[PDB]
Amino acid sequence: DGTWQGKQYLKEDGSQAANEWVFDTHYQSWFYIKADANYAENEWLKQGDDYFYLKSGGYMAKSEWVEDKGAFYYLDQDGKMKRNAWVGTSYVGATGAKVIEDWVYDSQYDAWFYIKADGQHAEKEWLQIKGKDYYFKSGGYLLTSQWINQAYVNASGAKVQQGWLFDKQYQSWFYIKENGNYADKEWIFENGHYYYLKSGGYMAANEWIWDKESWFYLKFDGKIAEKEWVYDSHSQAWYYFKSGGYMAANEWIWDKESWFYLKFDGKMAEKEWVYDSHSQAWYYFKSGGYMTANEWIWDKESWFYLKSDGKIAEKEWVYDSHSQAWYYFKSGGYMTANEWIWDKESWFYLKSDGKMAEKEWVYDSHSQAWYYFKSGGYMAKNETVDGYQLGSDGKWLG
């Protein structure tokens, strides 16, 4: 072909070569003869948008790296420099410089990679990049919008930390803890409200939860129920929950304007009697749970009176202004009727409807006699009324 003459290259025709590539077969290499008829060495050449590098001796660098003032560049088989391409496990940017410690998006793979301190791309490992945690699978691809063991990586590949996320395929809410794993059997406070995450992390919604000593109920949106009533259509009963969400059970509660009482199991007492154990008295609740107080109730063959404060009237007298008469209640609240009783110092008779005899003549069929009672129900015994004598025992003598 041609003949080397020092730095010069005389071609077949004598004319020394310049501004041209020549392939010499002895050296088995490409060389570039500059414009000054010398071969290029230890320098870059720009031809088109292509960059070549010619090593000591003029040999064109091909399939190898070339360090330019700290930065590293790769020259392919044709001697050309590479751009936005993978050289094995490393990456060259649009300037052809080796990327080290930075993010990389490759449109060919439609994925993200991170190049590490060693110039290699991360693979099958967790890395903490400027605070956040990212995961790369086999091949270096960055994982996005999915679950890894107990963590979730958002659409950006970052691990979620201290956040709420909704899985549409599971149809449940999860809270991701500060540590990166989801909450598991614990209470979480979010914007003024408490939520309970269940054994799988699934947020508890419309269900009962037992913590340490009492019951909690979680509503439609998973919020703890507190300071309110909830009707259990399964259990067919009303429950109440207080300041902390604690269901109240074996204790009393004021709501609307009525006292209420909640039984051992948190069921509101309704249409029934209850016996307080620290008050040692009986109480009765209407249909709807409302404490009856100062009003009559008819249970089984007996009338009862519950006074201004709701306690049962028993071994005591009561005036009832609505019916305008006096009544007496025995041991147990049993209102007395068609009976005598000894109180004060005189006798008292209570009519069939329970009303005490007050200012009237009454025929006791029992003793077959006519008795009279003065204002206040006091039987008359040794005196005259309307010219009618009365004996030592109260009977009419005549």
User: For 305-337, b where at least 16 C-beta lie within 10 A, e where not — what string?
Assistant: bbeeebbbbbeebeeeeeeebbbbbeeebebbe
Q: How far is the CB of 61 from ligand CHT (least distance, A)?
A: 11
Q: Residue number with the shortest CB distance to ligand CHT?
A: 244
Task: Please state the closest distance from residue 294 (CB atom) to ligand CHT, in A.
Answer: 12
Among 101, 376, 384, 397, binds ligand CHT (CB under 6 A): 376
Q: In the complex, what is the shortest distance from the CB of residue 80 to ligand CHT, in angstroms, rounded to a whole number? A: 7
Contact set for ligand CHT, span 146-185 (CB under 6 A):
147, 156-157, 164, 170, 173, 182
Q: Quick check: 72 binds ligand CHT (CB under 6 A)?
A: no
Residue 197 binding ligand CHT, by CB under 6 A:
no
The residues facing 372 across adjacent strands are 361
Q: Is 30 in the site for ligand CHT (CB under 6 A)?
A: yes
At a CB cut-off of 8 Å and minimum separation 6, what does 88 contact?
none
28: alpha, beta or left? (left if phi > 0; alpha if psi -120 to 50):
left
Q: Is 29 within 8 Å of 12 (Cβ atoms)?
A: no
**What minimum distance in Å lies between the beta carbon of 123 and ligand CHT?**
8
Q: Is 289 in the site for ligand CHT (CB under 6 A)?
A: yes
| CB-CB contact of 102 with 90 (8 Å) | no
Position 44 contacts ligand CHT (CB under 6 A): yes
**Site track 310-349 with ligand CHT (rule: CB under 6 A), x = hit:** x-x----x-----x--x-----xx------x--xx--x--
Nearer to ligand CHT, 12 or 255 (CB): 255
The answer to whether 173 and 162 are in contact (CB under 8 A) is no
Q: Does residue number 250 form part of the binding site for ligand CHT (CB under 6 A)?
A: no
Residue list 76-135, contact with ligand CHT (CB under 6 A): 78-79, 86, 96, 103, 109, 112, 121
Q: Given candidates 204, 329, 336, 377, which one binds ligand CHT under the rule CB under 6 A?
A: 377
Q: Dihedral angle at the C-alpha atoms of 25, 31, 33, 38, nearest 10 degrees?
A: -90
Greatest Cα-to-Cα distance within the chain, rounded to the nearest angstrom? 175
The number of residues that bind ligand CHT (CB under 6 A) is 86
In angstroms, give the least distance from the CB of 237 to ligand CHT: 8
Alpha-carbon gap, residue 380 to 345, rounded angstroms: 12
Helix (H, G, I), strand (E, B) or coil at 376: coil
Q: Does 65 bind ligand CHT (CB under 6 A)?
A: no
Q: What does the angle CA 244 – CA 254 – CA 261 come to, to the nearest 5 degrees?
A: 90
